[PDB]
Design a protein around this ligand. Structure first.
Ligand SMILES: COC(=O)C[C@@H](C)c1n[nH]c2nc(N)[nH]c(=O)c2c1=O
Ligand SMILES: COC(=O)C[C@@H](C)c1n[nH]c2nc(N)[nH]c(=O)c2c1=O
Ligand SMILES: N[C@@H](CCCC[NH3+])C(=O)O
Ligand SMILES: N[C@@H](CCCC[NH3+])C(=O)O
Lengths: 263, 263
């Protein structure tokens, strides 16, 4: 299906052999600290190592200014990248934060605003030649046709990315579940996820422990592993290449079993 | 989709509103005992109650002779049925065991041999007017076309059932995952499960903690919740009306989330 590999500098990711697991890193910051403290960064590193040991293929790291956001995240990327042999993505929508994070050692950019909040981030991406995840987002829930609108919206991000020099192969899409969508809309997007495929890019799903799962099951954030699991399984069936998750152990197993079944 | 309800005597099951959960009952027998002992039956009852409390819609209860099999199972059905307001299925392929179990208070018959080991069980079913689950089974793995063969095989069971007087509405099918199939064949059957639907009957999936999950994940029986989960999710996507499971709590949540998503 994919005639290319996601090239991530020193690491290469194969889009065909298995669903790729993106682990979500704890960023619990130290009070008293601007960033880089031993407690912050060591807690971070230990979590990255755990996620690595549990089957994570990527480590995702990401109010508050840009000056600060950098002081916070840069020390973490520097440490995790040295100590965890695994590609790193920076979870930011800010061009300068993305620039700093890549200089620090991040391999992938992860923009929850699909390059629309700071189009210059697409230029950063083009320049450094790193994959960029463009997630579906908007400031309203005023759709006329959820999926058609989503696809139009995502496609507007593809345009910004390609206009900036981003190679097709460095583009990944994200339905932006839990964003700018009612609970019912999130379920509808899940139900029709396979439609994103016609756009011709790898798809990352990010549903981990989200509010719509709590809304279906009526369970708090810490009781959402089974709901996340369902969404991950459905997502894999519908052709997604990555899943962004907190529970790396559990979701790796479900993903692996799904992979085996869908052949 | 279903213009009828599964009628189970005092209980009625709706095939449309949600995936129905069949909990698998522990039958840990007492040594020294022929059956009916306080420890056996109380352990059984407590488990049925737990499964009830965890979201189970049916309680499934089932070397060794027929005389004995009855002495073992009958006391359990009598107690569980009195004390757990939930339909009960007897897991047997023996006509007389099925007869005794229904007299005891079982509502559904569950035949892993699809009425081929003891065709008279279909007559028991017709007579008492209870739903019967016909599972796919055979004494060899010598297929020419797994799915086509399976469908032919299941259909041979439908014939035995209908020839005996079994109303269409009292028929449920089961792909018989983990039976007469290599690991690779089990995965293939999972992958193509939706094909069972053309037969026009409700489908029950029974994959809980099975060996093929252990074979994909390389994990022991007690470490198979995530694998079971995957198979349950896939199965629901492919149109199954029931799932037969050990982990009632966890699988109820995954099922419920799947239901919400697939609308
Ligand atoms: C730990 O989870 C979060 O930090 C919650 C939100 C803020 C979040 N951040 N970034 C994301 N990035 C992609 N690509 N897809 C997502 O669904 C997503 C999110 O849901
Ligand atoms: C606790 O699990 C078991 O007792 C293992 C086997 C023996 C088993 N018994 N009956 C079944 N009945 C239906 N309908 N579908 C099944 O997959 C199944 C089975 O897998
Ligand atoms: N079944 C495929 C999985 C590819 C990745 C699925 N997201 C192989 O094996
Ligand atoms: N989504 C359906 C579920 C029906 C049962 C699915 N096995 C309603 O709600």
């Amino acid at each position: 299906k994919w005639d290319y590999d996601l090239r991530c500098g020193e690491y290469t990711l194969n889009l065909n052999e298995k669903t790729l697991i993106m682990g979500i890193l704890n960023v619990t910051p130290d009070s008293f600290s601007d960033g880089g403290s031993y407690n912050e960064v060591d807690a971070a590193v230990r979590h990255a190592k755990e996620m690595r040991d549990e089957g994570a293929h990527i480590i995702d790291i990401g109010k508050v200014s840009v000056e600060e956001e950098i002081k916070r995240v840069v020390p973490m990327i520097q440490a995790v990248s040295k100590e965890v042999k695994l590609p790193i993505s920076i979870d930011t929508y800010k061009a300068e934060v993305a620039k700093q994070a890549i200089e620090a050692g991040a391999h992938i950019i992860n923009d929850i605003w699909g390059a629309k909040a700071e189009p210059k981030i697409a230029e950063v991406a083009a320049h450094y030649d790193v994959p960029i995840i463009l997630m579906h987002n908007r400031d309203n829930m005023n759709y006329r046709n959820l999926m058609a609108d989503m696809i139009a919206d995502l496609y507007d991000s593809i345009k910004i990315a390609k206009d900036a020099g981003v190679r097709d192969e460095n583009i990944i899409l994200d339905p932006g579940i839990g964003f700018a969508k009612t609970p019912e809309q999130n379920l509808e997007a899940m139900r029709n996820l396979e439609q994103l495929n016609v756009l011709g890019y790898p798809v990352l799903l990010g549903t981990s422990r989200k509010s719509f799962i709590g809304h279906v099951l009526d369970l708090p954030v810490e009781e959402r592993l089974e709901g996340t699991g369902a969404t991950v399984c459905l997502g894999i069936e519908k052709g997604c290449e990555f899943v962004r998750v907190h529970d790396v152990k559990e979701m790796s197993r479900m993903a692996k079993m799904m992979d085996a079944m869908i052949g």
